[PDB]
Design an enzyme around this catalytic site. Structure first.
Site, mmCIF file in Angstrom:
data_model
loop_
_atom_site.group_PDB
_atom_site.id
_atom_site.type_symbol
_atom_site.label_atom_id
_atom_site.label_comp_id
_atom_site.label_asym_id
_atom_site.label_seq_id
_atom_site.Cartn_x
_atom_site.Cartn_y
_atom_site.Cartn_z
ATOM 1 N N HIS A 93 30.027 19.045 -36.764
ATOM 2 C CA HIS A 93 29.841 18.635 -35.247
ATOM 3 C C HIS A 93 29.129 19.938 -34.550
ATOM 4 O O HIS A 93 29.797 20.197 -33.673
ATOM 5 C CB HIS A 93 31.114 18.438 -34.638
ATOM 6 C CG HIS A 93 31.413 16.963 -34.861
ATOM 7 N ND1 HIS A 93 32.199 16.639 -35.737
ATOM 8 C CD2 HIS A 93 31.017 15.942 -34.408
ATOM 9 C CE1 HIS A 93 32.281 15.304 -35.910
ATOM 10 N NE2 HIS A 93 31.355 14.902 -35.199
ATOM 11 N N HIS A 125 23.673 18.874 -36.014
ATOM 12 C CA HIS A 125 24.004 17.759 -35.644
ATOM 13 C C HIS A 125 23.200 17.420 -34.265
ATOM 14 O O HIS A 125 22.306 16.450 -34.424
ATOM 15 C CB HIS A 125 25.252 17.550 -35.547
ATOM 16 C CG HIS A 125 25.723 16.044 -34.984
ATOM 17 N ND1 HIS A 125 25.516 15.030 -35.929
ATOM 18 C CD2 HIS A 125 26.364 15.677 -34.129
ATOM 19 C CE1 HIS A 125 26.180 13.903 -35.132
ATOM 20 N NE2 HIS A 125 26.741 14.321 -34.152
ATOM 21 N N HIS A 140 25.319 15.301 -26.975
ATOM 22 C CA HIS A 140 26.169 14.560 -27.148
ATOM 23 C C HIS A 140 27.483 14.936 -27.786
ATOM 24 O O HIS A 140 28.505 14.320 -27.390
ATOM 25 C CB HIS A 140 25.651 13.327 -27.749
ATOM 26 C CG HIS A 140 25.967 13.529 -29.256
ATOM 27 N ND1 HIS A 140 24.992 14.337 -30.126
ATOM 28 C CD2 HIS A 140 26.830 12.904 -30.148
ATOM 29 C CE1 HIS A 140 25.697 14.213 -31.448
ATOM 30 N NE2 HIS A 140 26.445 13.391 -31.158
ATOM 31 N N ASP A 141 27.321 15.998 -28.231
ATOM 32 C CA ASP A 141 28.891 16.618 -29.056
ATOM 33 C C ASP A 141 29.016 18.217 -28.369
ATOM 34 O O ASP A 141 29.657 18.848 -29.107
ATOM 35 C CB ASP A 141 28.607 16.606 -30.426
ATOM 36 C CG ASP A 141 29.291 15.299 -31.111
ATOM 37 O OD1 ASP A 141 30.162 14.797 -30.502
ATOM 38 O OD2 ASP A 141 28.669 14.970 -32.199
ATOM 39 N N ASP A 163 23.643 8.763 -33.741
ATOM 40 C CA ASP A 163 24.611 9.548 -34.011
ATOM 41 C C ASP A 163 25.200 9.656 -35.542
ATOM 42 O O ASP A 163 25.770 10.395 -36.177
ATOM 43 C CB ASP A 163 25.829 9.393 -33.297
ATOM 44 C CG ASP A 163 26.962 10.431 -33.398
ATOM 45 O OD1 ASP A 163 26.708 11.547 -33.715
ATOM 46 O OD2 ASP A 163 28.167 10.120 -33.065
ATOM 47 N N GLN A 206 33.482 5.968 -48.564
ATOM 48 C CA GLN A 206 32.083 5.563 -47.997
ATOM 49 C C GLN A 206 31.633 4.194 -48.003
ATOM 50 O O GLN A 206 31.102 3.936 -47.126
ATOM 51 C CB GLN A 206 31.133 6.830 -48.703
ATOM 52 C CG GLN A 206 31.417 8.254 -48.654
ATOM 53 C CD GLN A 206 31.115 8.532 -47.074
ATOM 54 O OE1 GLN A 206 30.084 8.344 -46.741
ATOM 55 N NE2 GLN A 206 32.310 8.705 -46.520
#
Ligand SMILES: CN(c1ncnc2nc[nH]c12)C1CCCCC1
Ligand SMILES: [Mg+2]
Ligand SMILES: [Zn+2]
Length: 313
Positions: free
Chosen positions: A68, A72, A106-107, A217, A269
């Site tokens: 993050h 990113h 956004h993060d 994202d 996953q």
């Protein structure tokens, strides 16, 4: 305003593609981002003195966490750039402005822990914002940086365009809360399949922009296998730090976050691709057909994870 950013030939070509990797050179990432704004938005959307000062303040306020992080931020902004470029006419000048900034911010100030760990830790942010905890912080951090002297890249907008773009940005950032994605996608799936989906309806636009935000994202799952696979180590590096923190509070973390249970990673996953990724890019391709390449690449990487479980690689 006669200063254009250019990229080397290979970047210039590969940056238009969804599966573009921004590379291991941090010092090129701001130029990549400015390059994207100028082509997406116009060479005039922002004052370059203000934008660059905004970009470097945003970079400063991302932390040195495995996933993050600032990389990113720019990766997610490039994914939105690819979507906007393959869907030229569907978006207003303001939305293209807003969404690229939303993506980059956004993060903002992410510590590497879920909303769930804040609540169980009883972090002050959890008391201040009871849901979308980190996402309400990210938006708060974005407004703070826009309010630094010399940083208001939105200066030339009217009062009303200004409120519109912060509202586009706030909805955009909140929508990166994956707890809100499931309902949002289910509703879009429903409106598309009954024929009620209407892009001149602002509440419908809002949901569509939100799905795009989720798509951008999650876009680590749409890269070529070597990028997907090596990004997954950074994702699991944060997950295992959080799991460790859960155990220090005396709570057994879910197995995806327990570093004793690495053997279960490939199956983890599968679940995520099937429960989250494939659904997200299926709905996004139904509403915005030219984003099919994200679905195609996501299915390829699903197939790659299946081959890992069969022990082929
Ligand atoms: C990116 N998300 C993922 N979670 C689990 N496995 C993954 N493989 C690629 N992406 C994955 C999570 C990241 C952190 C917020 C929640 C979503
Ligand atoms: Mg986030
Ligand atoms: Zn993110």
């Amino acid at each position: 305003g006669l200063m254009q950013f250019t990229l080397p030939v290979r970047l210039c070509k590969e940056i238009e593609l969804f599966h573009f990797d921004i590379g291991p050179f941090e010092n090129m990432w701001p130029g990549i981002f400015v390059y994207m704004v100028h082509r997406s938005c116009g060479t005039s959307c922002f004052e370059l003195e203000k934008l660059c000062r905004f970009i470097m303040s945003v970079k400063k306020n991302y932390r040195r966490v495995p996933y993050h992080n600032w990389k990113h931020a720019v990766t997610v902004a490039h994914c939105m750039y690819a979507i906007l470029q393959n869907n030229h006419t569907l978006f207003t000048d303001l939305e293209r402005k807003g969404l690229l900034i939303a993506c980059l911010c956004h993060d903002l100030d992410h510590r590497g822990f879920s909303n769930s760990y804040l609540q169980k830790f009883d972090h002050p942010l959890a008391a201040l914002y009871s849901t979308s905890t980190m996402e309400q912080h990210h938006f708060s951090q974005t407004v703070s940086i826009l309010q630094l002297e010399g940083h208001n890249i939105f200066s030339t907008l009217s009062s009303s365009e200004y409120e519109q773009v912060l509202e586009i940005i706030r909805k955009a950032i909140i929508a990166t809360d994956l707890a809100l994605y499931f309902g949002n996608r289910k509703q879009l799936e429903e409106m598309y399949q009954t024929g009620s989906l209407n892009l001149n309806n602002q509440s419908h636009r809002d949901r569509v922009i939100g799905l795009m935000m989720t798509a951008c994202d999650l876009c680590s799952v749409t890269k070529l296998w070597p990028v997907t696979k090596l990004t997954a180590n950074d994702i699991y590096a944060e997950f295992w730090a959080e799991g460790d923190e859960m155990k220090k509070l005396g709570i057994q973390p879910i197995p995806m976050m327990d570093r004793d249970k690495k053997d279960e990673v490939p199956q983890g996953q599968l679940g995520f691709y099937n429960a989250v990724a494939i659904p997200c890019y299926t709905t996004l391709t139904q509403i915005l057909p030219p984003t099919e390449p994200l679905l195609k690449a996501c299915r390829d990487n699903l197939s790659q994870w299946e081959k890992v479980i069969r022990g082929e690689e």
